[PDB]
Amino acid sequence: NFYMVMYINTYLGNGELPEDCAAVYKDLLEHVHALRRLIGEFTLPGDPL
Amino acid sequence: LDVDATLAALRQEPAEVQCAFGAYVADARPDALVGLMQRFLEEWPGMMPVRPRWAAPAAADQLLAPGNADLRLELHPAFDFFVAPEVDVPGPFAVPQVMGQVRAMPRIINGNIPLALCPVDFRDARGFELSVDRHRLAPATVAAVRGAFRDANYPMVFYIIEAVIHGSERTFCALARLVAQCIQSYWRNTHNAAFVNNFYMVMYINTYLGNGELPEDCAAVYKDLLEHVHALRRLIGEFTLPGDPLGNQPQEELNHALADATLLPPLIWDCDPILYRDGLAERLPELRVNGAHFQHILWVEMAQVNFRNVGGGLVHNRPVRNENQPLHPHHDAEWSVLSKIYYYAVVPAFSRGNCCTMGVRYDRVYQLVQTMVVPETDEEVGTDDPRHPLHPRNLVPNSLNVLFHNACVAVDADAMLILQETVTNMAERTTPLLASVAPDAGMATVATRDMRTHDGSLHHGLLMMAYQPNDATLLEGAFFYPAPVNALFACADHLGAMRDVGAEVRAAAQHVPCVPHFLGANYYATVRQPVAQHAAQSRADE
Amino acid sequence: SFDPNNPRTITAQTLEGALPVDILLRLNRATAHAIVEDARRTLFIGTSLALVNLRRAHDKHLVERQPMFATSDYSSWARPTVGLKRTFCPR
Amino acid sequence: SFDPNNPRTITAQTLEGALPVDILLRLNRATAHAIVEDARRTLFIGTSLALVNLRRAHDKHLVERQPMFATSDYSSWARPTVGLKRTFCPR
């Protein structure tokens, strides 16, 4: 689930997870953030057509 | 520095008016200082009929296309030539409709050279050149600090503690126990740092706690973050020939730009820079705090707080430790320079265009910090006995204790109770500034006598790191309302925190920094756009 | 509480009996489509009522349940509303 | 100590009642701008007085509070003034 892997690190996050387990989910989210930023740098900013 | 004839030879063309945003600054009457951003947001899309050139640069090479309209205004390696309304700055808050004119203004820093004529690869190469055998950051240090800066669920209670301390001296040594427990908890919870967004706090950490209650493998981070600033400050020390103070200013201020005094830091917490700044008079510097010059006022208590004061008046949080004499600063000179270094050279190194300066609501945070729940016990018992202030029984909703429980921080009742001492020095509000300094003995030609700069700053503000829009445990615009001061410290996600966000403005905010036009525009500033763009899109091992 | 070989005998009168253990154990000792469908429906409702009754019985010994989410504000002008993460409130 | 649906009823007379728990629990069971503004002001002062009273009650059982910072000197010629780091003085 996408919504579950979001809620995990939004609410559970720094909480009950072990020191290591939450790292998986934090990485898994920052990766999607990077992929989303990717297309941000392959577009010449212009006016919505 | 001969540009008068060039300007006289450009204005012959009638007018080329295209936009007005990046080159117009307007003074504001001391009205509201929290709703000013409201009055500005609703007006902004009207200020940008077309896209601003300066925001998104032309290209790598298309700058040299044989017809584009940017070569016409790039003809000197130390000046900028743009269009602006035919008014005197500062002007009225409503943008006029006069015919345009071509002004000019020196790039005070070589970093202001546009990217197409100083590529990012070369800058990073020059850096990597200077970096050898000077000083470095251990990999664990940089790993931890990057994790902290890039974390997206940073506990809000730490921002609360930052806002309630506001860089005093007494209150920190008072809350030392709470700060230590918080740091300990967070480090053993995620292996990160804490309070790194505030410079005075990271100074205090290692100057007071240091050898004490912090773990050995954690305090090394706070020692590295300061010895690196020390090395960076020592850098300019060997790139200046020892000379003679020229304009009543030492040479080191003439060579570098940060080592200057007349350049106000982005975030201050007292009049410590303001006094030093006015010390010089050759290049007459003028300060404007919402219109009033300012009135130095001392500490304020719960007796007379008046959250609604709007005039020009700044506070000295229990001005000193001991003295309580009239009108004297309580820090050395190099303190402000170290702060400038930290915030202009190391913060954008880690954040890479995420941080944003925030205006804080001092009323609600003060309302909240008071409402604590703690039972009466002679001796502390620990978190297991239900008499503990963190046991689920006495977690009355909407308290302050529940905020501490939201972050899994482990504190004691006495350390919590210590918070009461904040009541000895309030913080009324956070207020904008606007410095105005003329070019120094360097660019002091007759043809530059009047081309002064304009840079703004926040007092008693706060720099938050990464916005967390996805949580519901707190209202969006509860405590902090965004106030970006410079192009480096202006993201576009923090605009969501502001209440009553438009549908159009947020869409057209990713491609333009959102500095309000009463906090200095991009051209009239001393740290232009291209350095921010460099810091944001470069990639050089941080 | 009923006999399994006849679905027509289950209803709110007989399902009010006790906890879901009785339902499941009754269904355990067994040995047109509209009949079984309606029976399934009433059985679902009955087991839900059984489960809420069980929760009542066990919750008579538990902590009070706070509102989990903030932003629900009527007297907002005084206090800032703050939710509570139900990470653990066991007793 | 008061009713939430009326802000005009809070004042120093009614807020003297007890600890901030009473204030917060009163505000919890709720159901022009100058009125609510003045009410917020008096409520702030009241909760501060409540908090200092709570600290008195709990501090009747704690250690004496030393001056944290040195350099405050009147009889300096005899002893050199030395501050104290309030790292931990819990009881």
Instruction: Please report the sign of the dihedral spanned by the C-alpha atoms of residue B60, residue B66, residue B71, residue B76.
Output: positive
The DSSP output letter for B91 is B
| Residue from B416, B371, B417 nearest B396 by CA | B371
Distance, in angstroms, between C66 CA and closest chain A CA?
Answer: 17
The greatest distance separating any two alpha carbons of chain D, rounded to the nearest whole angstrom, comes to: 65
Q: Which of B498, B482, B500, B481 is nearest to B490 (CA)?
A: B482
Quick check: C83 and B474 CB within 8 A?
A: yes
Written as six digits, the tokens of B201 are 């706090």
Method used experimentally:
cryo-EM
Nearest residue to B530 (alpha-carbon basis) of B53, B76, B149: B53
Helices and strands in chain D, H and E counts: 3, 0
Q: What is the rounded distance in angstroms from the CA atom of residue C68 to the CA atom of residue C65? A: 9
Give partners of C (≥3 CB pairs < 8 A).
A, B, D
Chain C residues closer than 8 Å to B403 by CB: 82
φ, ψ at D83 (rounded to 5°): -75, -175
Unique residue bearing structure tokens 């269904």: C27
Q: With H, G, I as helix, E, B as strand and everything else as coil, classify residue B151.
A: coil
How far is B80 from B107, CA to CA, in rounded Å? 7
Using CB atoms, pick whichever of D28, D45, D62 lies closest to residue B398.
D28
> Cβ contact (<8 Å) for A16 and C88?
yes
Mode of pairing for the β-strands spanning B267-268 and B455-459: parallel
Q: Note whether C82 contacts B364, CB cutoff 8 Å.
A: no
Q: After which residues is chain A broken (C to N over 2.5 A)?
A: none
For residues B74 and B62, the answer to whether their CB atoms sit within 8 Å is no
Q: Is C38 exposed, middle or buried (0-12, 13-18, 19+ CB in 10 A)?
A: middle
Q: Which helix (H) or strand (E) holds B105?
A: strand B100-106
Show the beta-strand stretches assigned E in B134-191. Answer: none
Note the Cα B141 to chain centre separation in Å: 23
In sequence order, what DSSP letters do the residues of C12-72 get, joined into one string?
Answer: HHHHTSS-HHHHHHHHHT---HHHHHHHHHHHHHHHHHHHHHHHHHHHTTS-------S--
Partner residue facing D86 (CB), from B174, B376, B397: B174
- CB within 8 Å: B408 and A15: yes
Q: Whole-angstrom Cα distance, residue B237 to residue B240?
A: 6
Reference B462, options B180, B200, B183; nearest CA is B200
| Cα(A19)–Cα(B153) distance, integer angstroms | 15
- Nearest of B207, B203, B160 to residue B369 by alpha carbon: B160
Report CB contact under 8 Å: C83, B473: yes
Q: Determine the distance from the C-alpha atom of residue D47 to the mean position of all C-alpha atoms in its chain, rounded to a whole number.
A: 7
- Calculate the CA dihedral of residues B29, B30, B31, B33 and round it to 10 degrees: 120
Rounded Cα distance, B210 and B179, in Å: 13
Residues in chain D closer than 8 A to C77 (CB atoms): 36, 39-40
Enter the tokens of residue B218. Answer: 């954690």
Give the C-alpha separation, B482 to A32, whole Å. Answer: 26
Task: Give the contacts of A47 (CB within 8 A, at least 6 positions apart).
Answer: B51
Chain A interface mutation, best of B153, B158, B493, B529, highest count of A Cβ atoms under 10 Å: B153
Please tell me what DSSP assigns to residue B516.
-
Q: Where are the alpha helices (DSSP H) in B334-425?
A: 334-341, 347-351, 362-370, 401-406, 413-417
**B63 in Cβ contact with B70 (< 8 Å):** yes
Q: Which residues of A touch B408 (CB under 8 A)?
A: 14-16
On whether the CB atoms of residues D91 and D61 are closer than 8 A, the answer is: yes
Q: Are B419 and B274 a contacting pair, CB within 8 Å?
A: no
With beta carbons less than 8 A apart as the criterion, state whether B400 and B191 touch.
Answer: no
Tokens (6 digits) for B75:
């003809």
C-beta separation of D49 from B153 below 8 A: no
Measure the CA dihedral B515/B521/B527/B530, to 10°. Answer: 80
**Among B176, B40, B170, residue whose Cα is nearest residue B95:** B40
Contact call for residues D49 and D16 (beta carbons, < 8 A): yes
Touching chains A and D? (3+ Cβ pairs < 8 A): no
